[PDB]
Amino acid sequence: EQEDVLAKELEDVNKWGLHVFRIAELSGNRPLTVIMHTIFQERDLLKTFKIPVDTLITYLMTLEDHYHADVAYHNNIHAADVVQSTHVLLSTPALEAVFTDLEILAAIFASAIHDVDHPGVSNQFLINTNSELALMYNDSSVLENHHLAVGFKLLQEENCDIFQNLTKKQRQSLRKMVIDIVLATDMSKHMNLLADLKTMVETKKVTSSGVLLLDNYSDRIQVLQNMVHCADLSNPTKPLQLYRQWTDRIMEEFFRQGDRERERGMEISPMCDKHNASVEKSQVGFIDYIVHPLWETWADLVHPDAQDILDTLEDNREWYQSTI
Amino acid sequence: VLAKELEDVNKWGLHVFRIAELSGNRPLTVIMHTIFQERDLLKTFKIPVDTLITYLMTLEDHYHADVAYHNNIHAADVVQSTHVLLSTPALEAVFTDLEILAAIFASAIHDVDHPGVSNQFLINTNSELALMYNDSSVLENHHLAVGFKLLQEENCDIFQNLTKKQRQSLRKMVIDIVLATDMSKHMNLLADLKTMVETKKVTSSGVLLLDNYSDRIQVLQNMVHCADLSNPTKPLQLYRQWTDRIMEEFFRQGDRERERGMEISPMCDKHNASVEKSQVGFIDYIVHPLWETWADLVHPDAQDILDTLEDNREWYQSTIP
Ligand SMILES: COc1ccc(/C=C2/C(=O)Oc3cc(O)ccc32)cc1OC
Ligand SMILES: COc1ccc(/C=C2/C(=O)Oc3cc(O)ccc32)cc1OC
Ligand SMILES: [Mg+2]
Ligand SMILES: [Mg+2]
Ligand SMILES: [Zn+2]
Ligand SMILES: [Zn+2]
Known part of the structure; x- marks a missing residue:
């Protein structure tokens, strides 16, 4: 059965080199939804943060919709791949018990929304063509600001707020961490981010x-x-x-x-x-x-x-x- | 009758509230049209006068009248004040007519469409603004976006006859200036000035x-x-x-x-x-x-x-007491 094969491929969610493209095929072009769902079950995040399973699926499906399927790279397969790769990097032995369950949730959620509604062109293209996105965000991290705005806004759709049972302070701390992480995906920050890591x-x-x-x-x-x-x-x-x-x-x-x-x-x-x-x-x-x-x-x-x-x-x- | 208060448009202490009432609640439109005929900016950048007026009129309209402080009078006051800190003797022809142009246009748009509440308020209330701008300089990002957006309405592009690099350079400077009006950057901005x-x-x-x-x-x-x-x-x-x-x-x-x-x-x-x-x-x-x-x-x-x-x-x- 098709979902018997897909479920077998999801056993590799903790492995580098997961067959993310085959999982896209086997899931019916929903790699982000099923990989996020699998990871949330694996890390027991539904129980920890009281996430109703139907709210999670509904948000993940609405979030995956807003990745452009006619954009060759920056699409839902890229988002699912970054989610799963982050999930593996989070499990590295040198970081055992370093991060709270909230920081883990922020890093995975940030990976899921980090390129949502990507139009397939660069920030510099959006600046030079006087796009409406560049006009909104004043030529500074134009895409990355947009990915965040869209990612958070979709939480307000019907039965989509997966963070409905976090406390106020958990909400505020997660939102700040998600913002700081996604803004750091801007390639213009790479040199300074690498220097800090050095x-x-x-x-x-x-x-x-x-x-x-x-x-x-x-x-x-x-x-x-x-x-x-x-x-x-x-x-x-x-x-x-x-x-x-x-x-x-x-x-x-x-x-x-x-x-x-x-x-x-x-x-x-x-x-x-x-x-x-x-x-x-x-x-x-x-x-x-x-x-x-x-x-x-x-x-x-x-x-x-x-x-x-x-x-x-x-x-x-x-x-x-x-x-x- | 308003024109002789405007004769003061070069002095610290312009009776801007008077000009606001004499202009029919248009202090920004008249104070900018005076500062532009005074620095002769309509020629240097070939600004058709009806186009400049059309933009300033649309700009002033997007300042809220029912907001007590962050309105068009404050904008008119900051324009005129920058205009005089631009005529200080120690800073006299150390700025291009383009850099002058940025500081004035930036002062003019620096609070446009201000709802009368703080960034922290907009953040804590999950406003559409804070949601759009990710809690970072929420108002100031919006002031810039509206100020540039209004240039694209009918007969409002006052920068139409700048060269291509000039427009990119003016945009970069206006953005850097208005974003620096965020009070959460005051302490960093003062240590650098010191x-x-x-x-x-x-x-x-x-x-x-x-x-x-x-x-x-x-x-x-x-x-x-x-x-x-x-x-x-x-x-x-x-x-x-x-x-x-x-x-x-x-x-x-x-x-x-x-x-x-x-x-x-x-x-x-x-x-x-x-x-x-x-x-x-x-x-x-x-x-x-x-x-x-x-x-x-x-x-x-x-x-x-x-x-x-x-x-x-x-x-x-x-x-x-
Ligand atoms: C799998 O290969 C690639 C995958 C992703 C990218 C994406 C890149 C992108 O969006 O902006 C860039 C800017 C740069 O200065 C260098 C690379 C990239 C580039 C790749 O190869 C060049
Ligand atoms: C004429 O007086 C005033 C004029 C403007 C302001 C505006 C202020 C504002 O928007 O954020 C602030 C934050 C601060 O920490 C101190 C002052 C302000 C405050 C004034 O007085 C307090
Ligand atoms: Mg990106
Ligand atoms: Mg302001
Ligand atoms: Zn990416
Ligand atoms: Zn102000």
């Missing part, structure tokens, strides 16, 4: 059990920011058959943006020129300048928990390099 | 020396921040009306914060407020440290302004 690794403090010692909001939210940031940039760390399909999708989306940029007489953004692009050189540069400096720093923070993930990234980089 | 003063570099003749952009934009941020917090530096009859209007607006919020069960915001409880102690605390802890630093930066220049401030503070303290 500083933390160099001054890393650990408890008598081997668990990372987080002392204040500034350190705890910064780790959660980089965790979701790593999950957002985790495609080159996955098994190659998954990585390659992510590369096909982002190039599909980029090339579309370049066709609109050229039609408009604009300068074509890097990697968006389908007449001058090297898919393979772009992935090597993506790994060398962005993904590997980030994941190698994260692996130091949780050493040695992320050695396999770092090994896969370096193998995949070697493979893409060899195709040139 | 730092610029601590290792200031002047010529010796008057003018101050800024080189890059991060410090030239900080000056107009603090400048519009000063003009925003310039009520206690104006003559006492003007200051006292501003005090009546802000406490009126605060008391309405405090009422709506009690018909809700919220913690009453500071100075908003009409049954536990000392209007006079609040003004003295406002001066001691916010207005005077800011204007001392501005007057140091522009030494002397703003000594009449700093004098009037400490006069007004002494008087308000004398109203406390």
